[PDB]
Ligand binder design. Structure first.
Ligand SMILES: CCCCCCCCCCCCO[C@@H]1O[C@H](CO)[C@@H](O[C@H]2O[C@H](CO)[C@@H](O)[C@H](O)[C@H]2O)[C@H](O)[C@H]1O
Ligand SMILES: CCCCCCCCCCCCO[C@@H]1O[C@H](CO)[C@@H](O[C@H]2O[C@H](CO)[C@@H](O)[C@H](O)[C@H]2O)[C@H](O)[C@H]1O
Lengths: 472, 448
């Protein structure tokens, strides 16, 4: 199965591969590289050609033409130097930036790129085709990408998923003026941000500023994810909004503050931790709820999903969104396929339900996150089908006698039952349901309705064990 | 004015539809206007018109007033099949698709056949693999082939041929007449008459199926939403001919294979030369019409019960889409569609999303138009449910003439805010007026 790959993400694939080659202290055969990238051996060689020629003299790459290639750079340098070159060269990257940030006609854009219109227009058509799954379009006059504003911005941000930490794609926006504002938010929130995370929050601030400069602003938020206007994160952005409006001559209405605030909050997914997690959970919980409802509707498990099941769903969503604030993606490919072979129908179903969200959300869900959800839900199916019946032991004779009965029930039934040793505060249907009790075994009559009770003697008789057996 | 999403796999379809359009219109077409229909550069439009000059007979009326654009009307007694076929054979992507679905190959072997370097073929393969994800297909590496559900692979290939000419046969190892003979017998057995193109497209599908069976691939698994009843005439017709089919071609048809061919046969009869196949159609497609309605309703939440009449229209819409295989050329309606889309953009998108969650066998046939049809059809119910008034039963112990009189009084008061049920003592009734000639006391009571 060839991996489905697109011309928009070529630069992403090259960067990840280059990183892979370096981390591994081993030889890479041309056959093996051809297969990672999915290209002709001759194309693997054109790339090695650029690589060898663009390495700084500091690094060394070996090629004995029988065992393949080997790359080692010093531990103190980063891959930034070559990574940036890959980006500055990527033609399709430049076109996507043009189409999102700049004024052009077909002919004007063809000019900047030193291309014949008959060379550009097939590429544009392909790009228009590829982005349909993202709910975007390319309109013809002026020549630009269009769609829901937040979808357009995340698209750009996702194409920058693995940019180096010192790579700034906006020459017409001075970085420090964004950095000053972030330093200030970091201070107000009394948190410390990882370098990469921060850089990427700067990049998202600049994507947003550039759009506002071009006339483009958010005029519709779906409700599924809003930063509450009383949250520390909305308010911390609101604090810097005036300095930002004055540095760059833009206007941030409420819904832009909320968006940047969401960005802020997400970039703190990891920081070098309490009130953060809480805003995180309140903000994402409604999405976790819609996802769960979506999937349940197709899987028909019949379960009620409790709050800690939904908290894991927030966790997985968080892993998804954090990809913007961590440079390099870890692979897991074997792990993923094992999950996919074990639960193929469930895997596809969840893929479908995630793909019916907004692009803002499903842009971040790959096979791995889907495999995460797949395990999450299949775990419930096993627990609901295999968990033993929970039993509450009620006795007029006090707690020593309660325990003694409890051990007798266990001696007899082992794993067909689970004794609930906590003392129930009262006998209302709510107190029983919040201990998830299925069966009460009592030596006393009780005013209780909708839940099997087996009245037994103060020491169970064989008749008692027989009644209990039936309803277990 | 959004650029249309277009794929490299359907260039040949686009050029054939355009060539047909330039002919059928008795008016000029400017170069700019052709560039926009095809979403290509002027150099590229000009290059196509050059190829068109050179392959058109000089008998055929082809004008090029540079500044006015171009004009064409072929003689009424000749076919475009001539030029369309050249478009089909020239198309590289279509040949790669055919290779991928019908042949054994490796990368190096396929690049050999197409006289290309591997570094020119591989990007095209990646692009196709990327484009067919939404069809639930994939490309295997070894052997190099297209992969997915067998019904889906077949329909993929069938739709790449959506507008091939009536004599176009891309199967040099399947003897066309050997298939036509089998279809002819079925046409006799059902006592019906097919249109020529429809018949040709049913032979094509047969050849696709036969080519696939010989290459190892058969249908393992149905969806359930469309099977022909194993007691249905159509199934039995196919069962008649199956044995000779098998000894001719050296393939075995199990039950589900027969059922697929029976489906094709029945869809191809969608249109034919003038009652009974219509009833058989409805039976087979009604389960899908119910699935489509239930999925859409789940998202629109209109709260209605959809009647047998509403469903039957869904089935009509489905037929319109499935008929695209048995009608060569596609008429467009761009304006009409975008009007519908503007009037109901959220409903449009929801229906698009719902349809796209069916199997590819189905959603391959739904483009903007069919989505637009379903959108009206569902926004229509919304409007009925809301504006259609409350039904009333007049009951009086005074005779049927007092009953009529009081009924007419009410109508003369409230007009279309009510609707009288003239049938006698589950009949859609909400309100009961009963007791002798109403007064104001009675009237304001009836308002509420
Ligand atoms: C097999 C593993 C492969 C993974 C890693 C391989 C990717 C390596 C990235 C190579 C990118 C090199 O980035 C390099 O930048 C310099 C400028 O600084 C460009 O310099 C360019 O100048 C002009 C055009 O602008 C021309 O003379 C020529 O087209 C080019 O030399 C190179 O065209 C580009 O190749
Ligand atoms: C723009 C509006 C008009 C839309 C309609 C577009 C019309 C397009 C019609 C062109 C059909 C192509 O017609 C096809 O072209 C090539 C010429 O390139 C012909 O011939 C080709 O054959 C040999 C094969 O050995 C090639 O190596 C050679 O270079 C070429 O001449 C085909 O035999 C002919 O069938």
């Amino acid at each position: 199965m060839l991996t489905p790959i697109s011309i928009e993400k070529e630069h992403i694939r090259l960067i990840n591969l280059l990183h892979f080659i370096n981390e591994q202290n081993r030889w890479f055969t041309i056959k093996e590289l051809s297969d990672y990238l999915q290209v002709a051996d001759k194309t693997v060689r054109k790339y090695l050609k650029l690589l060898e020629d663009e390495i700084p003299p500091s690094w060394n790459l070996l090629v004995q033409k029988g065992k393949g290639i080997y790359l080692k750079k010093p531990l103190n340098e980063s891959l930034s130097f070559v990574e940036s070159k890959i980006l500055r060269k990527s033609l399709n990257l430049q076109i996507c930036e043009e189409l999102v940030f700049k004024k052009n006609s077909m002919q004007s854009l063809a000019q900047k790129l030193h291309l014949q219109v008959g060379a550009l227009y097939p590429i544009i058509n392909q790009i228009n085709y590829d982005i349909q799954s993202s709910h975007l379009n390319i309109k013809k006059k002026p020549l630009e990408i269009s769609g829901r504003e937040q979808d357009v911005r995340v698209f750009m941000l996702r194409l920058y998923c693995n940019i180096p930490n010192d790579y700034w794609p906006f020459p017409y926006i001075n970085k420090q003026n964004i950095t000053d504002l972030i330093n200030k938010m970091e201070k107000i929130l009394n948190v410390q941000m990882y370098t990469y995370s921060k850089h990427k929050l700067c990049v998202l601030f600049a994507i947003t500023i550039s759009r506002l400069l071009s006339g483009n602003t958010i005029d519709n938020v779906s409700g599924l994810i809003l930063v509450n206007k009383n949250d520390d994160h909305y308010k911390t952005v609101a604090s810097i909004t005036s300095e930002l409006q004055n540095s760059f001559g833009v206007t941030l209405h409420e819904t832009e503050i909320s968006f940047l605030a969401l960005a802020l909050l997400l970039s703190l997914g990891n920081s070098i931790s309490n009130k953060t997690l809480t805003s995180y959970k309140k903000t994402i919980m409604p999405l976790a709820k819609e996802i769960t409802k979506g999937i349940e509707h197709k899987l028909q498990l019949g379960i009620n999903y409790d709050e800690s099941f939904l908290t894991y769903v927030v966790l997985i969503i968080k892993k998804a969104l954090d990809k913007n604030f961590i440079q390099y993606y870890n692979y897991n490919i074997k792990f993923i396929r094992h999950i996919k072979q074990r639960h193929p129908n469930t895997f596809n179903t969840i893929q479908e339900c995630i793909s019916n969200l907004n692009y803002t959300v499903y842009s971040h869900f790959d096979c791995y996150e889907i495999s995460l959800l797949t395990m999450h839900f299949e775990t419930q199916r096993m627990l609901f089908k295999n968990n033993p019946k929970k039993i509450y032991v009620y006795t007029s004779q006090g707690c020593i006698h309660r325990e003694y009965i409890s051990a007798l029930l266990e001696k007899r039934y082992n794993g067909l039952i689970k004794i609930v040793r906590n003392t129930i505060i009262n006998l209302t249907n709510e107190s029983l349901q919040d201990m998830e009790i299925d069966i009460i075994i009592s030596n006393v009559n009780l005013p209780i309705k909708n839940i099997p009770i087996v009245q037994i003697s103060e020491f169970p008789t064989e008749r008692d064990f027989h009644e209990i057996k039936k309803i277990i």
